mmCIF file of C-alpha atoms in Angstrom:
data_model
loop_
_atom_site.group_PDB
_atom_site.id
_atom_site.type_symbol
_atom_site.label_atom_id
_atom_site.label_comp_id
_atom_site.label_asym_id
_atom_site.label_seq_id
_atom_site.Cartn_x
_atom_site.Cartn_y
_atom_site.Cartn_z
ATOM 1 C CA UNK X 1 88.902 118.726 110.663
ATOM 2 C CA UNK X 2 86.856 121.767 109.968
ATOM 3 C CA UNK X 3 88.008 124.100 106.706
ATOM 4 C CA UNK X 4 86.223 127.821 107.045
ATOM 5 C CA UNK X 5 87.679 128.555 104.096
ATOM 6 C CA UNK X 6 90.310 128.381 101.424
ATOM 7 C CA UNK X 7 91.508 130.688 98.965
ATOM 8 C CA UNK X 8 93.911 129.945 96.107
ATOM 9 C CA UNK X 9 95.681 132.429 93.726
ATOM 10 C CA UNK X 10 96.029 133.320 89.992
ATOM 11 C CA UNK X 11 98.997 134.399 89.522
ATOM 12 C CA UNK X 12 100.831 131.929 92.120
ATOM 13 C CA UNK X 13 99.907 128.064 91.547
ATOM 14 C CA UNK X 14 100.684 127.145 95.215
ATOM 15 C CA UNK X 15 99.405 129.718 96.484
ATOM 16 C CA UNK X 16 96.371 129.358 99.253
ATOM 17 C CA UNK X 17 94.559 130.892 102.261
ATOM 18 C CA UNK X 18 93.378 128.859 104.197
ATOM 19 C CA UNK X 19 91.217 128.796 107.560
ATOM 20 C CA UNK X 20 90.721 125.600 109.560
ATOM 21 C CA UNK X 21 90.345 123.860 112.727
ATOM 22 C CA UNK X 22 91.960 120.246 113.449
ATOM 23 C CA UNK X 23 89.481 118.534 116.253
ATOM 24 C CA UNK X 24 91.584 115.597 117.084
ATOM 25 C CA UNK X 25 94.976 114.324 116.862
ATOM 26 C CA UNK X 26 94.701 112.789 113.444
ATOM 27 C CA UNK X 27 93.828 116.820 112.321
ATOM 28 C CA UNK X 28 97.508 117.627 113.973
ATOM 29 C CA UNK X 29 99.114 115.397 111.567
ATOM 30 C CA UNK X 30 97.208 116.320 108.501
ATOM 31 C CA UNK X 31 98.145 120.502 109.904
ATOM 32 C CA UNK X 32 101.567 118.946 110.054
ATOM 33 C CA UNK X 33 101.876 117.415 106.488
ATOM 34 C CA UNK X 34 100.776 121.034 105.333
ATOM 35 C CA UNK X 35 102.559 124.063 106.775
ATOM 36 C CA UNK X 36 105.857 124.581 105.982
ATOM 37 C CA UNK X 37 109.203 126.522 106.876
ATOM 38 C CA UNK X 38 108.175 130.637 106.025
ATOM 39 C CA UNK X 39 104.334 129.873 105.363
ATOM 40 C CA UNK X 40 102.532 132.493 107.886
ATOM 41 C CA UNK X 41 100.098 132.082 110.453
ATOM 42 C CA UNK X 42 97.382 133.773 111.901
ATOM 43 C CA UNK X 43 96.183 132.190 115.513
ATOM 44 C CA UNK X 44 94.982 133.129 118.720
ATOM 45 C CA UNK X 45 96.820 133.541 121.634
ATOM 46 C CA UNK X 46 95.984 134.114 125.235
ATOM 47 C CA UNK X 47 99.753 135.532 126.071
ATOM 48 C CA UNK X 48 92.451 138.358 126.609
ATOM 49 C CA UNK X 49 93.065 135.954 123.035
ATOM 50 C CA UNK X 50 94.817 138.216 120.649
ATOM 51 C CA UNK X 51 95.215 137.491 117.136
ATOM 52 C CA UNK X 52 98.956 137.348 116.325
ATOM 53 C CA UNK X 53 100.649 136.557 112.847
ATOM 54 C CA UNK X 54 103.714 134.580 112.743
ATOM 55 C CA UNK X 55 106.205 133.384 109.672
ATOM 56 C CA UNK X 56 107.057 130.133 110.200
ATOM 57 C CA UNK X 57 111.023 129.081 111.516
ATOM 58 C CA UNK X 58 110.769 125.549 112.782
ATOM 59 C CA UNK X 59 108.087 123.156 114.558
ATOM 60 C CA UNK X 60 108.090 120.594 117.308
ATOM 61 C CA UNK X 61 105.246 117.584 117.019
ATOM 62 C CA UNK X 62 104.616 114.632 118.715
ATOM 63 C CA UNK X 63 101.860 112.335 118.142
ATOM 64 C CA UNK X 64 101.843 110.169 121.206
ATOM 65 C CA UNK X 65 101.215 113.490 123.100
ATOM 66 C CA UNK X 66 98.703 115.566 120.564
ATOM 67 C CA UNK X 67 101.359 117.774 120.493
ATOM 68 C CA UNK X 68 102.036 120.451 117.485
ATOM 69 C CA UNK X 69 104.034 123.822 117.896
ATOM 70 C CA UNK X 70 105.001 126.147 115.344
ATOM 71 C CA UNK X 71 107.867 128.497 116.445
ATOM 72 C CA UNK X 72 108.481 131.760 114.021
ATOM 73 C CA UNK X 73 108.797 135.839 114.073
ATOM 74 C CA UNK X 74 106.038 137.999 114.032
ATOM 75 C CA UNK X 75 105.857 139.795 111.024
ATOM 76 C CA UNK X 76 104.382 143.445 110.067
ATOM 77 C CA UNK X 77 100.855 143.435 109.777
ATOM 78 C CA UNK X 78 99.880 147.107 108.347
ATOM 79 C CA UNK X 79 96.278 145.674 108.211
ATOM 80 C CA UNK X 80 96.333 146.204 111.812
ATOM 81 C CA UNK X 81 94.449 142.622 111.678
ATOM 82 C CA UNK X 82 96.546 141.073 113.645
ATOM 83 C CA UNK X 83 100.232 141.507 115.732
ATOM 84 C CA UNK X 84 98.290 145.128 116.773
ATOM 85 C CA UNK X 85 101.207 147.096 118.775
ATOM 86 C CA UNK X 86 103.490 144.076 118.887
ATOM 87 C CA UNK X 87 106.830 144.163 116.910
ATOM 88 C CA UNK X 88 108.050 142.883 113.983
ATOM 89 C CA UNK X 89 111.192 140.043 114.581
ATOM 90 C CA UNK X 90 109.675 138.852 118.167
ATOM 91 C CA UNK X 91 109.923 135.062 118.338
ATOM 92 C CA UNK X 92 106.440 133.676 119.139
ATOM 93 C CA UNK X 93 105.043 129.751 118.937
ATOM 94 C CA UNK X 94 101.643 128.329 118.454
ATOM 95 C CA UNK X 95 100.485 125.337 120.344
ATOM 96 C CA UNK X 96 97.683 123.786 117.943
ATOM 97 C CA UNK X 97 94.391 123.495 120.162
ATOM 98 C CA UNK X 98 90.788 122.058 118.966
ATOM 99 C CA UNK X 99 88.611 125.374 119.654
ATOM 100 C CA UNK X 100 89.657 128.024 117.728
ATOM 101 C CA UNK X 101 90.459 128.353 113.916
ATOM 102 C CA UNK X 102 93.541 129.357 112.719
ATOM 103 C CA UNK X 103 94.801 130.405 109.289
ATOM 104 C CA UNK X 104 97.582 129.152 107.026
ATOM 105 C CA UNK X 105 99.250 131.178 104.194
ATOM 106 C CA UNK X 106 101.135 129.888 101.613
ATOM 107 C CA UNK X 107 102.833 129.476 98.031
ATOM 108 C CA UNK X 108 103.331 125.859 97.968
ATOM 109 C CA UNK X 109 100.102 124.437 98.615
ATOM 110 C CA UNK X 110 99.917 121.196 96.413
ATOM 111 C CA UNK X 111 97.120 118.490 94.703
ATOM 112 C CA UNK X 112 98.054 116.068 97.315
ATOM 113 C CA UNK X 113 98.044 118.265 100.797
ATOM 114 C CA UNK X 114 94.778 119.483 99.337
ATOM 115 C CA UNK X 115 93.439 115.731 99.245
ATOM 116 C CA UNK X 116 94.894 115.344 102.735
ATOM 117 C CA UNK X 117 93.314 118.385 104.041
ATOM 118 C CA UNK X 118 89.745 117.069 102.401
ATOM 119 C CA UNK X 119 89.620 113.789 104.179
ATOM 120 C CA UNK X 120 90.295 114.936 107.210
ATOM 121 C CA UNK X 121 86.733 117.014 106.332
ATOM 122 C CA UNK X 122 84.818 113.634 105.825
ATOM 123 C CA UNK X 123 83.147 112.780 109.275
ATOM 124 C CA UNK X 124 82.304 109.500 108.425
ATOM 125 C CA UNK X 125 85.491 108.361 106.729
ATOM 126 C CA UNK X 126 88.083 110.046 108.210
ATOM 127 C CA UNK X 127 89.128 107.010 109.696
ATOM 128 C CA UNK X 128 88.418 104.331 107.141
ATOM 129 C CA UNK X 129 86.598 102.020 109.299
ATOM 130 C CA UNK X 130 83.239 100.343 109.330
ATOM 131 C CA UNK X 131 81.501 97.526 111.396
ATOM 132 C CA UNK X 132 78.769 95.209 111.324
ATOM 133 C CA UNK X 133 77.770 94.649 115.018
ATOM 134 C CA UNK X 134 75.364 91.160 115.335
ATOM 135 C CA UNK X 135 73.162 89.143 117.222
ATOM 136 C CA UNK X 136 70.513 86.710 116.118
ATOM 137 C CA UNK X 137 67.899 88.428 114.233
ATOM 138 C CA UNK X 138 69.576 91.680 114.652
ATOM 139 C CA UNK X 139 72.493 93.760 112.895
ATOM 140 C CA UNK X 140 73.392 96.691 112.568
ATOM 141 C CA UNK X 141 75.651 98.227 109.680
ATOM 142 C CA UNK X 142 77.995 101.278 110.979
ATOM 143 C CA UNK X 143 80.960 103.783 110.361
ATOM 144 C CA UNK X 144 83.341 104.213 112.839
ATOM 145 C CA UNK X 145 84.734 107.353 113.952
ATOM 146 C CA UNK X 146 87.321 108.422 116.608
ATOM 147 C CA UNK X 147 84.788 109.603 119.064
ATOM 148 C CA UNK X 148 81.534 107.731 117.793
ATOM 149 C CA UNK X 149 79.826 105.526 115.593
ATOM 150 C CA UNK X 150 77.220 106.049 112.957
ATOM 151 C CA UNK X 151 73.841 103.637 112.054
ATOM 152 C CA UNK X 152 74.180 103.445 108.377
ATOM 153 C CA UNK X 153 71.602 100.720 108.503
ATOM 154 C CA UNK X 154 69.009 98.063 110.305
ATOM 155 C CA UNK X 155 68.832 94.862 109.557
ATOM 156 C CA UNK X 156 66.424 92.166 111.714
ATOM 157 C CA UNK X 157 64.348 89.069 111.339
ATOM 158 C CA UNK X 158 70.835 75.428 115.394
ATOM 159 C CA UNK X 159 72.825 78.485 114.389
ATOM 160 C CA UNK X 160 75.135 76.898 112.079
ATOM 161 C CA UNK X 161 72.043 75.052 110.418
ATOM 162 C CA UNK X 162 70.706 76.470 107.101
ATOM 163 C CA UNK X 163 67.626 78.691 107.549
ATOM 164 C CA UNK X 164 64.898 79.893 104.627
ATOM 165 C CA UNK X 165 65.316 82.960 107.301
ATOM 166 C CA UNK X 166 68.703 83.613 108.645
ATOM 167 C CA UNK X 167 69.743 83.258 104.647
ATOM 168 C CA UNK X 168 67.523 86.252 103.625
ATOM 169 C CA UNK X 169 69.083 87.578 106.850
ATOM 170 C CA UNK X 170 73.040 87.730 105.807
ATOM 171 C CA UNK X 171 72.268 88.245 102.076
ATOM 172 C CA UNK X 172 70.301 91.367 103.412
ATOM 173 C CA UNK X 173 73.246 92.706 105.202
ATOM 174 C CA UNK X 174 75.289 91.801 102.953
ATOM 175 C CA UNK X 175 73.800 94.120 99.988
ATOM 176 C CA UNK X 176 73.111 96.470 102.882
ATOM 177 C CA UNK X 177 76.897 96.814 102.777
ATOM 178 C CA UNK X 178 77.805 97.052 99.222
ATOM 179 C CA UNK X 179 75.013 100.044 99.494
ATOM 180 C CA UNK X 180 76.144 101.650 101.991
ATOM 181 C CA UNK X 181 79.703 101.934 102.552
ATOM 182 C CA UNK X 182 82.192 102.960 100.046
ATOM 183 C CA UNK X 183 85.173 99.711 99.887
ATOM 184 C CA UNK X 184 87.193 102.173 97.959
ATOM 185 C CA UNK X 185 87.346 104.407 101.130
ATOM 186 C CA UNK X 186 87.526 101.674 103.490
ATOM 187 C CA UNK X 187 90.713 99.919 104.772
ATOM 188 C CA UNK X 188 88.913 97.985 107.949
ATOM 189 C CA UNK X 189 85.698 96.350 108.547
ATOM 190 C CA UNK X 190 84.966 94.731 111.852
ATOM 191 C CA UNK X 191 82.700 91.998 111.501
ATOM 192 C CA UNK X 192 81.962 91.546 115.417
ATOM 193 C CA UNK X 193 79.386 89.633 117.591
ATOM 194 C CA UNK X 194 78.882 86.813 120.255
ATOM 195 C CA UNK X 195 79.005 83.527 119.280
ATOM 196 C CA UNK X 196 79.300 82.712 115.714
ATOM 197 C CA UNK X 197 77.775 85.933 113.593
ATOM 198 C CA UNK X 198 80.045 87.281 112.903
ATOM 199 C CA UNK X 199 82.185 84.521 111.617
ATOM 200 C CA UNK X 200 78.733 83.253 109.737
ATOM 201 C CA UNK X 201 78.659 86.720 108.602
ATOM 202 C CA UNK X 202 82.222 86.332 107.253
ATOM 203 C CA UNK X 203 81.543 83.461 105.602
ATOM 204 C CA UNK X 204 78.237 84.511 103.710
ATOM 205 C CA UNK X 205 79.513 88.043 102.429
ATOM 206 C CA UNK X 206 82.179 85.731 100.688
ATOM 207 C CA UNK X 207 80.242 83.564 99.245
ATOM 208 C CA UNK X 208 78.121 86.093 98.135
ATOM 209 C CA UNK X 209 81.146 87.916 96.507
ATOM 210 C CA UNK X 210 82.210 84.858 94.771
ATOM 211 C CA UNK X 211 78.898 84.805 93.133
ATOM 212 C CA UNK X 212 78.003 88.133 92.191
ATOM 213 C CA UNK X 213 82.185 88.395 91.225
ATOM 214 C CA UNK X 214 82.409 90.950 93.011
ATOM 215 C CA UNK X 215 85.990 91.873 93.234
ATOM 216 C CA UNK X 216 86.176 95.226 95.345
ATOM 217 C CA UNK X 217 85.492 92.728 98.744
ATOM 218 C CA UNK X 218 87.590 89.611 97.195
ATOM 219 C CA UNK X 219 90.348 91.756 96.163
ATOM 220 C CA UNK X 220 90.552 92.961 99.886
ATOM 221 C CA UNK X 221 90.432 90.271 102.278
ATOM 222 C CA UNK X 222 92.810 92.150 104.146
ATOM 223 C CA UNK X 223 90.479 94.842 105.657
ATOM 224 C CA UNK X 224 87.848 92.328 107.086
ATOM 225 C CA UNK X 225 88.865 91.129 110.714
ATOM 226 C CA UNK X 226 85.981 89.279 113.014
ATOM 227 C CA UNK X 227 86.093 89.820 116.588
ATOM 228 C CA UNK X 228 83.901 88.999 120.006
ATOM 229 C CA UNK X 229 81.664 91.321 121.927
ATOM 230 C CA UNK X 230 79.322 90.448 124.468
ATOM 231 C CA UNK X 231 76.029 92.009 122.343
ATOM 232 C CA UNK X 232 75.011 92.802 118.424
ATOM 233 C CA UNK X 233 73.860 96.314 119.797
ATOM 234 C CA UNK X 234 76.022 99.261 119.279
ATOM 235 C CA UNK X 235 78.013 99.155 122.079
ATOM 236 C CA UNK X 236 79.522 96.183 120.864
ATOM 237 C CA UNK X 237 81.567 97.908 118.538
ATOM 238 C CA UNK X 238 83.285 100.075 121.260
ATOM 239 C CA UNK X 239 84.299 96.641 123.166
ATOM 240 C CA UNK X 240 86.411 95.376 120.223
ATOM 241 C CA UNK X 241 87.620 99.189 119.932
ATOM 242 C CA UNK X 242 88.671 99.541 123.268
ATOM 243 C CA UNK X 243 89.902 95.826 123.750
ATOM 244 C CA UNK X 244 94.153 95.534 123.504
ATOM 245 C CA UNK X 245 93.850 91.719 122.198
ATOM 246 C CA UNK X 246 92.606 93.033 118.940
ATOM 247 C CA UNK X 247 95.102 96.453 118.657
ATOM 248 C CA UNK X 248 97.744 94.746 116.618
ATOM 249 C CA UNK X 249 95.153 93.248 114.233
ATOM 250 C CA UNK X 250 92.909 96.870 114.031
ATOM 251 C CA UNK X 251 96.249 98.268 112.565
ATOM 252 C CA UNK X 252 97.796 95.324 110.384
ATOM 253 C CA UNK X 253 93.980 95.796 108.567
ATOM 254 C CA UNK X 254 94.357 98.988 108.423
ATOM 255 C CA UNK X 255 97.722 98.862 106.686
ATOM 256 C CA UNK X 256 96.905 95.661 104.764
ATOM 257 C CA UNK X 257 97.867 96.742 101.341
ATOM 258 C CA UNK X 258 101.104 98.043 102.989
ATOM 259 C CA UNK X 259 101.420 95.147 104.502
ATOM 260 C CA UNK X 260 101.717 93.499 101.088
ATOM 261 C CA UNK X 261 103.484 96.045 99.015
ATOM 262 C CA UNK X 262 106.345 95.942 101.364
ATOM 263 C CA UNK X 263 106.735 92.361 101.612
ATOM 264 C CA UNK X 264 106.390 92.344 97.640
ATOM 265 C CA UNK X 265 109.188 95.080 97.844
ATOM 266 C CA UNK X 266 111.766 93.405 100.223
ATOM 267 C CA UNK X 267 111.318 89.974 98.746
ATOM 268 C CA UNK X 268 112.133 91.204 95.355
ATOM 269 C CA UNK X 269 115.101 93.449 96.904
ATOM 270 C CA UNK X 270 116.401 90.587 99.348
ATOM 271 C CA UNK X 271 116.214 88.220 96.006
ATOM 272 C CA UNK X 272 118.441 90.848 93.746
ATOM 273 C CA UNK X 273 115.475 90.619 91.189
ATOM 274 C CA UNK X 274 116.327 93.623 89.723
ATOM 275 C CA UNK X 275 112.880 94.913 90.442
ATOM 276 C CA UNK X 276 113.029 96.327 93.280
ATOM 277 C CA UNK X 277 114.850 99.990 93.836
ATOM 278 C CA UNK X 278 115.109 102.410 96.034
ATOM 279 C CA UNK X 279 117.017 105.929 95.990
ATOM 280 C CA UNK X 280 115.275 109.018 93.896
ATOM 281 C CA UNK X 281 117.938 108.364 91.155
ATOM 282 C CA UNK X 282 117.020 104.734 90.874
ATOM 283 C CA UNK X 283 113.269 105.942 91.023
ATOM 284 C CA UNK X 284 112.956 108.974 88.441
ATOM 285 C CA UNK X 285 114.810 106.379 85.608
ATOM 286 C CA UNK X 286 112.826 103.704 86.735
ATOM 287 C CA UNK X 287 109.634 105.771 86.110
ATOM 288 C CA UNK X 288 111.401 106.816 82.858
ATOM 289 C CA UNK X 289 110.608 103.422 80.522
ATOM 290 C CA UNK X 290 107.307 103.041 82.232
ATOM 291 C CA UNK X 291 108.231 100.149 84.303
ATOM 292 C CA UNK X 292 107.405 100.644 88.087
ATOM 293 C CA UNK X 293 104.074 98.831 89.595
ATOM 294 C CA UNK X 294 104.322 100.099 92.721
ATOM 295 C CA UNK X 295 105.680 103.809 94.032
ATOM 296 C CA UNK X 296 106.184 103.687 97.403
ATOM 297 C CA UNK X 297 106.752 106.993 99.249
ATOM 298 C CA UNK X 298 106.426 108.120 102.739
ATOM 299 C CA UNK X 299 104.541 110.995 103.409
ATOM 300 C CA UNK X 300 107.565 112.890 105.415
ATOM 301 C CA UNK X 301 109.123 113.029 102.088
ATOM 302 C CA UNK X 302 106.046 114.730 100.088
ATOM 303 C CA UNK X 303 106.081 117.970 102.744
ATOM 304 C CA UNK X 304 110.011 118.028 102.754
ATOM 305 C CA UNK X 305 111.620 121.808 102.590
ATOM 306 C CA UNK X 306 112.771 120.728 99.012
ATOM 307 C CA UNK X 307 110.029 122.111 96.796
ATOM 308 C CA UNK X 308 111.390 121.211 93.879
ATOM 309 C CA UNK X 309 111.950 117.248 94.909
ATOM 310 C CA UNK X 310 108.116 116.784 96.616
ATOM 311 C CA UNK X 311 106.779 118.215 93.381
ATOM 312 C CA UNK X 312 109.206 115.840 91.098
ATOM 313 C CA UNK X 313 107.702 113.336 93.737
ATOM 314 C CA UNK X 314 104.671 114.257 93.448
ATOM 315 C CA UNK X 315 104.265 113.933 89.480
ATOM 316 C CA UNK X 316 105.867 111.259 89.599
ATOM 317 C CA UNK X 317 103.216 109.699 91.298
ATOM 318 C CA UNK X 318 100.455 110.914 88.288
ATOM 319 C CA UNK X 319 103.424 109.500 86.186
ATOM 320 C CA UNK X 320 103.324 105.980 87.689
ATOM 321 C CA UNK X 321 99.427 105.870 87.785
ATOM 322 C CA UNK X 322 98.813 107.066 84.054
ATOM 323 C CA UNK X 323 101.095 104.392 83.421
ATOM 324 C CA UNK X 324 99.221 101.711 85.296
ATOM 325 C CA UNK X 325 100.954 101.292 88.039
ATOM 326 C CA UNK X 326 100.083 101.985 91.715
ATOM 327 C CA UNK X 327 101.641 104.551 94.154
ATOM 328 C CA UNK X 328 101.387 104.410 97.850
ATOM 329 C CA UNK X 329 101.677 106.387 101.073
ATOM 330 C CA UNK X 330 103.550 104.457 103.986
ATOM 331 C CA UNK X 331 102.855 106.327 107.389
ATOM 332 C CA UNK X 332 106.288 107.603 109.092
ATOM 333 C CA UNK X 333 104.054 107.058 112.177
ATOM 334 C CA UNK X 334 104.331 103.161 111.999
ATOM 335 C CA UNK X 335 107.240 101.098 111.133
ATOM 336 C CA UNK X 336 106.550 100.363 107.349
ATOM 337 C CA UNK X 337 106.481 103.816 106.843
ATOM 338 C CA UNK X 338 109.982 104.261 109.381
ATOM 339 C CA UNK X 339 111.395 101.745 107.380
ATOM 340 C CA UNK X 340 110.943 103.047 104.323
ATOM 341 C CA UNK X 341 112.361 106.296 105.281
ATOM 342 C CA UNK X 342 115.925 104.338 106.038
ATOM 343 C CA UNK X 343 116.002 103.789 102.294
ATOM 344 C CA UNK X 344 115.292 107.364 101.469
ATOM 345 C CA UNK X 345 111.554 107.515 101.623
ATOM 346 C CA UNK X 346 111.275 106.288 97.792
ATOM 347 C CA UNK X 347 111.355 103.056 96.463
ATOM 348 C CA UNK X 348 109.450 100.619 93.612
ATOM 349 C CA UNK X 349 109.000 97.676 92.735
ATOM 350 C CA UNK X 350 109.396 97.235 88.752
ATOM 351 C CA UNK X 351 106.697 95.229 86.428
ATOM 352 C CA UNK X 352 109.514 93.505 84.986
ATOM 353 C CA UNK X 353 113.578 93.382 85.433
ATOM 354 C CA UNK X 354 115.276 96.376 84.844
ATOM 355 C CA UNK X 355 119.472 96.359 85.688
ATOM 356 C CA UNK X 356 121.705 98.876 86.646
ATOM 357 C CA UNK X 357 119.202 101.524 87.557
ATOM 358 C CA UNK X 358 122.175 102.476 90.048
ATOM 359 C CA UNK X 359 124.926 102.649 87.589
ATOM 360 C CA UNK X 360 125.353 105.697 85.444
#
């Protein structure tokens, strides 16, 4: 994502100009978390590229197919900066493409689409991933992106036996990582190579966290996941990317935490615990004495058409945090995040007991 520019308001709160351009499909779901029903925009269209100006009515996405359309009116432009000599009340659509800019206006622009919007900026996080591609005496530590991957760092220097060399070797990488990439960002590392690096590699940078205590790695076993390539160079990388044995486990990294809260939920929920709830009634008194750990939310029901709601929603989130718990974000594009939605895209799971949350 590329942001041109972005203007907010004084005297509106939500309100926000802003000028952008997605460049892969990832961008067309952040663009879709954003605009909503009677937000304008401003685009080109070829149907000599005009600028035209449309007021949002309704959209049509599809991920699988990199597929966004907004469908509105045209609306007066006395500006004459766009919809020259075309009529007010024409129904118009704009299919999202990754060359030209367009422009979003609107009064409900919130803390959390703004985050969104923002990390889909970050080149080198966008995707949360990094790597550590290895061979003997050789590896290198990387961020992955959609298209490429980035050298963060060089590291270089019978292969199960203990080594004066190969030790200064992994405890090198090892604080070459801690250095270099952010684990608060993160939500995968690949630890590839051929032969046994990169399970050595695995090994070591747990040991080493043991030691130093370090509890952003231990904390997150989840995101590591080792894999085979044929070399410790670069391309490496792309071979575990590219290779379908390893899809399921790419995601289930990715989604770790998820992975986790979930179960947490539905095992206190399939147990009738009493802390675990779902519903927004349930929720908001839940949140009331203080007592939810986790907030789980999908992210189709922070953009909803019900301003009022996604912004209860959303403070409710501050809410949970300031009160030391966690809230999370379950992806409607995955089944976590599907499943949630069947019990009304809102749920928790409570520090301790807490009956009749239901009952009023």
């Amino acid at each position: 994502m590329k942001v041109i520019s972005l203007k907010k308001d004084s005297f509106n709160k939500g309100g926000a100009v802003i000028t952008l351009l997605p460049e892969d499909k990832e961008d067309l779901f952040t663009v879709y978390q954003i605009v909503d029903k009677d937000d304008e925009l401003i685009f080109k269209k070829k149907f000599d590229l005009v600028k035209l100006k449309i007021k949002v009515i309704s959209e049509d996405f599809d991920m699988k197919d990199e597929y966004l359309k907004y469908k509105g009116v045209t609306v007066t432009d006395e500006s004459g900066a766009s919809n020259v000599d075309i009529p007010v009340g024409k129904y118009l659509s704009f299919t999202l493409d990754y060359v030209y800019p367009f422009t979003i206006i609107k009064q409900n622009f919130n803390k959390f689409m703004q985050k969104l919007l923002n990390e889909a900026c970050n080149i080198e996080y966008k995707s949360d991933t990094a790597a550590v591609v290895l061979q003997e005496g050789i590896a290198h530590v990387c961020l992955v992106t959609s298209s490429s991957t980035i050298l963060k760092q060089k590291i270089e220097y019978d292969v199960l036996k203990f080594d004066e060399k190969t030790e200064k070797f992994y405890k090198a990488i090892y604080s070459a990582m801690k250095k270099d990439l952010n684990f608060d960002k993160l939500k995968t590392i690949i630890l590839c190579s051929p032969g046994f690096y990169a399970k050595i590699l695995m090994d070591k940078i747990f040991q080493y966290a043991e030691e130093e205590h370090n509890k952003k790695i231990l904390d997150n076993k989840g995101m590591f996941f080792i894999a085979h390539c044929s070399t410790g160079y670069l391309q490496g990388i792309n071979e575990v990317l590219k290779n379908p044995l390893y899809a399921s486990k790419l995601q289930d990294t990715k989604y770790s935490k998820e992975i986790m809260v979930m179960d947490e939920f539905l095992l206190h929920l399939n147990k009738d615990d009493d802390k675990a709830w779902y519903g927004e009634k349930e929720v908001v008194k839940a949140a009331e004495y203080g007592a939810i750990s986790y907030l789980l939310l999908t992210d189709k029901v922070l953009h909803s058409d019900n301003i009022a709601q996604r912004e209860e929603y959303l403070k409710l989130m501050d809410s949970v945090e300031s009160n030391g718990g966690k809230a999370l974000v379950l992806s409607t594009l995955h089944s976590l995040g599907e499943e949630l939605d069947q019990l009304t895209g809102i749920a928790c799971i409570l520090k301790y007991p807490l009956p009749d949350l239901d009952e009023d």
